[PDB]
DNA sequence: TCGGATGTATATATCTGACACGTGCCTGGAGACTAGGGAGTAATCCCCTTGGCGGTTAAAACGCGGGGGACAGCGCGTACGTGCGTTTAAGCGGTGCTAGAGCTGTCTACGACCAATTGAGCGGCCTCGGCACCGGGATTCTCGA
DNA sequence: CGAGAATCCCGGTGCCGAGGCCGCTCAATTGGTCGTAGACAGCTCTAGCACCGCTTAAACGCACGTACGCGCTGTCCCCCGCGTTTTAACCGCCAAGGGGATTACTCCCTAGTCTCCAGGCACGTGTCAGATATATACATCCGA
């Protein structure tokens, strides 16, 4: 059947999480999954270029970061590292 | 074994039409010489699109051009569209 | 700049009241210190603007930039989203430790008749409104001209509706006494900024004819509704007062 | 006799009409007729899937309707309320098309 | 062993795993750090949420309560850090914003 | 009526250990502090002394704000806080030119 | 005496700036206009020469080439002199604001 | 802490940018709103190179950082590297 | 050499390795890096070309960037391939409005 | 030192080939050089696109080729081609 | 479309080839316009023929043509954005090399004006004249009487012409000293002319030219005009200007 | 000064390879820059999208929109070649001598 | 100055289908592990950024006469909007035909990879000629009559 | 026509960066095993293409007319040009030393790999969100 994976579930879990009474159309779905798949080859891809240009052969976290600050803009990318910081602190704390 | 050349269906482009876009565009008066130049840029506009959609078809050893192929077209024309893929 | 004074370098810290002081209240004391300006009640769920550290409801502020300008409904300072702001839970606290009660609904006939308080309180300078009868959405208002301006002793009729979704839409204000100004329409109809494109959430009808009466003081002939009007006004200055006297001598007193 | 609006006030409608809306304006048939008639210089005996042909009308028409709010900018920066080629070419000459 | 998600670890939603994945296998080094799946997740869960709420509200707004492409660009095109970001980007079906200029307005 | 040895911790500064004398927050916080307490704190760290948040990159003076509006309620709660700040502020500048 | 008719040698001067290759900014107040905006970013910065040049490169080519745009925004409108809310539109339908 | 500096751009340059750029009539409220748009720009540019410089973990704004950053603006600059 | 035996000057072997890094893809082509150093040799021959035509219409033998300019755009195609990159030391092709010209 | 590379002599050579009697300056020759330099990443950026969407994990000359069709405009492209098609084949000639 | 063949195309024969050993007889202006290259006024060497026109030039020539000015056609004003738009042409070449041994391997920019000065003698066009005041060839004397059917019908008019370095590569600078009453004629001497302007290519002349402003006495261009107050003295419209203009120019030159 | 040569000498520049005679309305190759008579490339091309002779391909689709008539070139074979204009005008007015339809041709 | 003809905002019955959740399933993600190695980090050579005389002079400021141009007012005129009648074809679906995308199993030619090893290419030194510099004078646009 | 700069032109000269040689380091070349991606014939079936009468929405055509593009024009005014005066960018350049480059080296961290298994998707199914439509009431525009 060959499956084709998707971010469907994801942001439909995250849906339910900030407002628990609406629902979600498949056009918009696709819409937000193609978004999401953007936004994941923009970081990706800036995060490439900041390991390539400190010959660096490692994407960590930092890279990561900084590619965040340098895409998103104001506050957005403010709130952006701060729940990354906070995921990747609370993942290093539970084992 | 099934061949058929289309001709002027840009005129397929009808003046209410692009009446209609400029309407969603936020134009209170139209004139006469704006339908003409429309249509040549929507022309133009297709003309590059397609022709990278294509292009990206035939590298896909492929007779038939898919919806991502038209997405990667816009894409690196700096034209990134939702709602199809990518 | 924040160059300390010549106290501040050496400012002494106030001794907090450790004794037992029990301190007395009034919903009228600290009433301008905690209403949000955009529904004119208690604040709930307090946001707070980063740029201009001014207070308003959750709801208010995120239904004001949702429904209208990204400005701050307040100072009009660039608000370009909820981001732009954060909750402030040192005052919900202090207002939730001193009112108990909390607030009620924030429905828009209920501000309405919290700025008719508001007007019935303090009545602002030469201005006056109020509803025409048990309708509380047609107001009727009266406009008393300024002494500057060529208006002495007019006391002009206005008509006043409230959209239903105020106060997140400006109210339909017009005129119904005839008179000569490049900015008033011959129906009633007024040129301001603040009635159309730039009304504000936590504006008043107060402000609103305060700001017509600075109207009156200071005409606007850039746009205006009837050019000849404005034409006179900026060419002579003679013939505009002459005639706005005589129509506020005929058409007003 | 008759009831005739003053010209202006059913273009105002209209744009008001279509500024909410959502769905495409360009007839579906036509538009693919010129997609494949534009597209047959390029490869012979093209097929196109349908989500192809919608991409492409998708795009098209929201590029038209953007290019139509710069030219209509254009039009009104000139103190005028009609747009005119001249708007439109402007446009894209500062959009670096042109 | 009693075996538990990355996303669960990290208090995500966002598979952290297949971020990681994808992120090995898409060509963008040689080697990653495991802290760059959970923060790009992180992030990605942060932008889907801050989009997804707006949008609710926009939906909210036009008495519907699915959430349509058509409220997506409501919610996009009113929040300039949003639209800058998605300033290159065409949502489908999603119309634009309602703005009729002061000029062409009626005398 | 409500006792105001419940309500001093709202109005308390943590840097003088007082009531807000013209109060000062912090943007990206909220925080409230003493003006003369803050301007002098900042010149050292450039982060909040209470929740340790980065209040700028380099300059901490750009993201603090004077709050009239929480100054004015520390003023109207406390009983002769104004009047002994003036009684203060004009015994000092009385014998200093 | 002697006298030269307003936008002779202004025309001039177009078609003199236009043959050279220079740059047209000052250089030490434009590396102090520099390191003035990079203080807001990062404490005690230190800056190549090449950076700076780099830097005045990028600015002169923008500002000459939104000039460009500028001027037809004016010509548009019936007019011969650029004015504010031609720079306006110009940076309106480059995509800036 | 450096001083204004934003009327470093003084008016003759500015002419000059408009000379260069095929202008013959220039207003005066031009060469503010010309200042305000290249502290705009600059601002943009800088803090990206600035960013660049502190991932690299460096107290020293090289060139690279600066064409780097004009790069991820969509402007790409010759006669630096890259 | 790959270069001599392609008939290219552009270094083959240097551009296959750095085809090889960069994280392009798993494995690089055997005719790629020929391919692509041959399309580099000969953009850069257009434009050495073009360039070297514009520094003899300026009487100079050695070429300056204000030639690269001139040659770039004064090229549709190269204009369009380099529409978004700035060329230090170029300055602007001379152009002066119709409108502008003096008049009365 | 780390020897830093450019494509200095090979822009020199060729320049020799196009033009005997023709010089360059250092400006011009580091602003070849970022030519250079940017259209060999894209070209490859492009070609690696081309290799990903296709599910192949091998950039050989045919992507590279596709890539100059996407990115060259007009003749510009079409020469490129011939150039590249040439190449290739003198290469298989000679192996 | 176009290339549908007629009844008569549908069933041609061949022509066929004279195989005969005989010789042609042509002069050296026979295949002139043929072989000629519109910007150097020469026979041509190096052929390069445009893909979209087939119009045929030198290769130096249309390159620099290209290079300096607009980027379209010097005979058609068809666009071509550089110089790969148009091939090689060997076979012009060869055909060249047959009938005319003799390339010439030195052009422009004194041989050009010089072959124009021949192409003016030869046949001068309609009432018009020009010539080099003295020895220097770059600084010419044209000599325009007034056509007929015109508001300047009798007279005479003197101007100068200036030939840049790199004509004609660049359009030569043309000023009317003799002070004519006309829309596009400045006072100063100065001609708002589009195609000595922008609109320039390499394969004008100076017969185009004065040719080009012997119609514009006729029927002038009042949308960019050098003067606006002549612009309301066609407004007038076309019964003023035939007594102004012929009282203050055609009675100061006749 | 007056030349003059053997017109079989010139005869290859100016015969069409398809017909293997002169050329007659003569159409070129623009991708290539090859000659025909307009009759046999535009029949050519009806069975073929590549050149006759150096099979280069004249276009990806539609061949037809890479041809341009050559008129200098038919101006050439018409001067050095004696005669050939009139007989093919004879030729043209003799076909329509019998057959009342379309002139313009 | 205002009431009636248009058509937009609004309300609610009602059938339709896509949103949404349950389920068997299968593969990708998790867990425990070793060890090569990129990266951390203290150490150190030394390039290049930074400060600051003071002395110059071209460039930037300030001011003033005034001429070309922005801009508000007005009017001849035509191009475009509004509305109804004629007419073109888009949209509908009903559906058979099959091109060709998609998946699978098999055979096999492609390229990474370790290894041996020599020159291609970069850091670096030096004679020299392109070119910036320089000043007398050719001369060509400009402004007035 | 004629005065007056001001760009261009021409012969001379001081200067430094373009170009060629050379020491030599290290990356490209030569050559072979082999895991494996890629070529490819083979095969299931989704989905694109042609078909084709029909209700009718919509494009089209056209007459009447008024808001609006456009040329004309008088008047306030604001940049232009230019001499004088004020100001700091520019330059030579020795000198403190931050800090970027490079190097030697211990080691934390991630690729790599076999296994267990449940998270994730395709599939099936019931119904509520919404499209739908008759039907209100409503805000809004405009002439006698
Ligand atoms: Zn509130
Ligand atoms: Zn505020
Ligand atoms: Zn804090
Ligand atoms: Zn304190
Ligand atoms: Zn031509
Ligand atoms: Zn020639
Ligand atoms: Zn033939
Ligand atoms: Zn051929």
């Given at each position: 059947?060959?499956?084709?994976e998707s971010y469907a579930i994801y942001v439909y879990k995250v849906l339910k999480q900030v407002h628990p009474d609406t629902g979600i159309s498949s056009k918009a779905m696709s819409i937000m999954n193609s978004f999401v798949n953007d936004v994941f080859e923009r970081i990706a891809?800036?995060?490439?270029?900041?390991?390539?240009?400190?010959?660096?052969?490692?994407?960590?976290?930092?890279?990561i970061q900084?590619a965040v600050?340098?895409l998103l803009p104001?506050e957005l990318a403010k709130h952006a590292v701060s729940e990354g910081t906070k995921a990747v602190?609370k993942?290093?704390?539970?084992? | 074994?099934?061949?058929?050349?289309?001709?002027?269906?840009?005129?397929?482009?009808?003046?209410?039409?692009?009446?209609?876009?400029?309407?969603?565009?936020?134009?209170?008066?139209?004139?006469?010489?704006?339908?003409?130049?429309?249509?040549?840029?929507?022309?133009?506009?297709?003309?590059?699109?397609?022709?990278?959609?294509?292009?990206?078809?035939?590298?896909?050893?492929?007779?038939?051009?898919?919806?991502?192929?038209?997405?990667?077209?816009?894409?690196?024309?700096?034209?990134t569209?939702y709602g199809?893929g990518g | 700049?924040?160059?300390?004074?010549?106290?501040?370098?050496?400012?002494?810290?106030?001794?907090?009241?450790?004794?037992?002081?029990?301190?007395?209240?009034?919903?009228?004391?600290?009433?301008?210190?905690?209403?949000?300006?955009?529904?004119?009640?208690?604040?709930?769920?307090?946001?707070?603007?980063?740029?201009?550290?001014?207070?308003?409801?959750?709801?208010?502020?995120?239904?004001?930039?949702?429904?209208?300008?990204?400005?701050?409904?307040?100072?009009?300072?660039?608000?370009?989203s909820k981001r732009?702001?954060?909750?402030?839970?040192?005052?919900?606290?202090?207002?939730?430790?001193?009112?108990?009660?909390?607030?009620?609904?924030?429905?828009?006939?209920?501000?309405?008749?919290?700025?008719?308080?508001?007007?019935?309180?303090?009545?602002?300078?030469?201005?006056?409104?109020?509803?025409?009868?048990?309708?509380?959405?047609?107001?009727?208002?009266?406009?008393?001209?300024?002494?500057?301006?060529?208006?002495?002793?007019?006391?002009?009729?206005?008509?006043?509706?409230?959209?239903?979704?105020?106060?997140?839409?400006?109210?339909?204000?017009?005129?119904?006494?005839?008179?000569?100004?490049?900015?008033?329409?011959?129906?009633?109809?007024?040129?301001?900024?603040?009635?159309?494109?730039?009304?504000?959430?936590?504006?008043?009808?107060?402000?609103?004819?305060?700001?017509?009466?600075?109207?009156?003081?200071?005409?606007?002939?850039?746009?205006?509704?009837?050019?000849?009007?404005?034409?006179?006004?900026?060419?002579?200055?003679?013939?505009?007062?002459?005639?706005?006297?005589?129509?506020?001598?005929?058409?007003?007193? | 006799?008759?009831?005739?609006?003053?010209?202006?006030?059913?273009?105002?409608?209209?744009?008001?009409?279509?500024?909410?809306?959502?769905?495409?304006?360009?007839?579906?048939?036509?538009?693919?007729?010129?997609?494949?008639?534009?597209?047959?210089?390029?490869?012979?005996?093209?097929?196109?899937?349908?989500?192809?042909?919608?991409?492409?009308?998708?795009?098209?028409?929201?590029?038209?309707?953007?290019?139509?709010?710069?030219?209509?900018?254009?039009?009104?920066?000139?103190?005028?309320?009609?747009?005119?080629?001249?708007?439109?070419?402007?446009?894209?000459?500062?959009?670096?098309?042109? | 062993?009693?075996?538990?998600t990355r996303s669960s670890?990290a208090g995500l939603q966002f598979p952290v795993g297949r971020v990681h994945?994808l992120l090995?296998?898409?060509?963008?080094?040689?080697?990653?750090?495991?802290?760059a799946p959970v923060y790009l997740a992180a992030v990605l869960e942060y932008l889907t949420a801050e989009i997804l709420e707006l949008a609710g509200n926009a939906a909210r707004?036009?008495?519907?309560?699915r959430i349509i492409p058509r409220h997506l660009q409501l919610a996009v095109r009113n929040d300039?850090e949003l639209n800058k970001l998605l300033?290159?980007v065409?949502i489908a079906?999603g119309?634009?914003?309602?703005?009729?200029?002061?000029?062409?307005?009626?005398? | 009526?409500?006792?105001?040895?419940?309500?001093?911790?709202?109005?308390?500064?943590?840097?003088?250990?007082?009531?807000?004398?013209?109060?000062?927050?912090?943007?990206?916080?909220?925080?409230?502090?003493?003006?003369?307490?803050?301007?002098?704190?900042?010149?050292?760290?450039?982060?909040?002394?209470?929740?340790?948040?980065?209040?700028?990159?380099?300059?901490?003076?750009?993201?603090?704000?004077?709050?009239?509006?929480?100054?004015?309620?520390?003023?109207?709660?406390?009983?002769?806080?104004?009047?002994?700040?003036?009684?203060?502020?004009?015994?000092?500048?009385?014998?200093?030119?």
């Amino acid at each position: 059947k060959t499956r084709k994976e998707s971010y469907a579930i994801y942001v439909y879990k995250v849906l339910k999480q900030v407002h628990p009474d609406t629902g979600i159309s498949s056009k918009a779905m696709s819409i937000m999954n193609s978004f999401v798949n953007d936004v994941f080859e923009r970081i990706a891809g800036e995060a490439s270029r900041l390991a390539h240009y400190n010959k660096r052969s490692t994407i960590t976290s930092r890279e990561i970061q900084t590619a965040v600050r340098l895409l998103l803009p104001g506050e957005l990318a403010k709130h952006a590292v701060s729940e990354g910081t906070k995921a990747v602190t609370k993942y290093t704390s539970a084992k | 074994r099934h061949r058929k050349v289309l001709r002027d269906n840009i005129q397929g482009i009808t003046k209410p039409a692009i009446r209609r876009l400029a309407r969603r565009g936020g134009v209170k008066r139209i004139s006469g010489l704006i339908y003409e130049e429309t249509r040549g840029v929507l022309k133009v506009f297709l003309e590059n699109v397609i022709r990278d959609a294509v292009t990206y078809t035939e590298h896909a050893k492929r007779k038939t051009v898919t919806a991502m192929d038209v997405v990667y077209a816009l894409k690196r024309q700096g034209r990134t569209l939702y709602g199809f893929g990518g | 700049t924040w160059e300390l004074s010549l106290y501040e370098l050496q400012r002494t810290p106030q001794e907090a009241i450790t004794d037992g002081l029990e301190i007395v209240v009034s919903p009228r004391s600290l009433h301008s210190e905690l209403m949000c300006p955009i529904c004119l009640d208690m604040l709930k769920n307090t946001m707070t603007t980063k740029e201009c550290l001014h207070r308003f409801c959750a709801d208010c502020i995120i239904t004001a930039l949702r429904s209208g300008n990204k400005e701050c409904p307040t100072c009009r300072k660039k608000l370009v989203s909820k981001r732009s702001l954060r909750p402030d839970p040192n005052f919900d606290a202090l207002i939730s430790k001193i009112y108990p009660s909390g607030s009620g609904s924030r429905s828009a006939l209920k501000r309405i008749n919290k700025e008719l308080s508001d007007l019935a309180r303090d009545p602002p300078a030469q201005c006056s409104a109020g509803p025409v009868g048990d309708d509380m959405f047609h107001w009727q208002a009266t406009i008393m001209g300024p002494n500057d301006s060529p208006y002495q002793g007019g006391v002009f009729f206005l008509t006043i509706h409230f959209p239903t979704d105020y106060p997140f839409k400006p109210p339909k204000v017009a005129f119904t006494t005839r008179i000569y100004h490049p900015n008033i329409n011959s129906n009633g109809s007024i040129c301001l900024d603040i009635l159309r494109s730039q009304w504000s959430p936590a504006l008043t009808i107060s402000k609103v004819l305060l700001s017509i009466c600075s109207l009156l003081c200071d005409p606007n002939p850039d746009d205006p509704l009837v050019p000849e009007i404005a034409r006179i006004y900026k060419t002579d200055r003679d013939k505009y007062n002459r005639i706005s006297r005589e129509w506020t001598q005929k058409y007003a007193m | 006799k008759p009831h005739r609006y003053r010209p202006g006030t059913v273009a105002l409608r209209e744009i008001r009409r279509y500024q909410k809306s959502t769905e495409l304006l360009i007839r579906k048939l036509p538009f693919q007729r010129l997609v494949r008639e534009i597209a047959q210089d390029f490869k012979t005996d093209l097929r196109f899937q349908s989500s192809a042909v919608m991409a492409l009308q998708e795009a098209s028409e929201a590029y038209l309707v953007a290019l139509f709010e710069d030219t209509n900018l254009c039009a009104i920066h000139a103190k005028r309320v009609t747009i005119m080629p001249k708007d439109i070419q402007l446009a894209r000459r500062i959009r670096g098309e042109r | 062993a009693k075996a538990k998600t990355r996303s669960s670890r990290a208090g995500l939603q966002f598979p952290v795993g297949r971020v990681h994945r994808l992120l090995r296998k898409g060509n963008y080094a040689e080697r990653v750090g495991a802290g760059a799946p959970v923060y790009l997740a992180a992030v990605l869960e942060y932008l889907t949420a801050e989009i997804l709420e707006l949008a609710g509200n926009a939906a909210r707004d036009n008495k519907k309560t699915r959430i349509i492409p058509r409220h997506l660009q409501l919610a996009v095109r009113n929040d300039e850090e949003l639209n800058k970001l998605l300033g290159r980007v065409t949502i489908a079906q999603g119309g634009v914003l309602p703005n009729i200029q002061s000029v062409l307005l009626p005398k | 009526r409500i006792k105001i040895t419940e309500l001093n911790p709202h109005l308390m500064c943590v840097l003088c250990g007082g009531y807000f004398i013209d109060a000062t927050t912090i943007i990206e916080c909220l925080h409230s502090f003493c003006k003369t307490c803050i301007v002098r704190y900042l010149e050292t760290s450039k982060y909040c002394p209470i929740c340790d948040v980065q209040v700028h990159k380099t300059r901490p003076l750009l993201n603090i704000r004077s709050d009239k509006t929480l100054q004015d309620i520390v003023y109207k709660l406390v009983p002769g806080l104004f009047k002994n700040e003036m009684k203060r502020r004009r015994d000092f500048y009385a014998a200093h030119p």
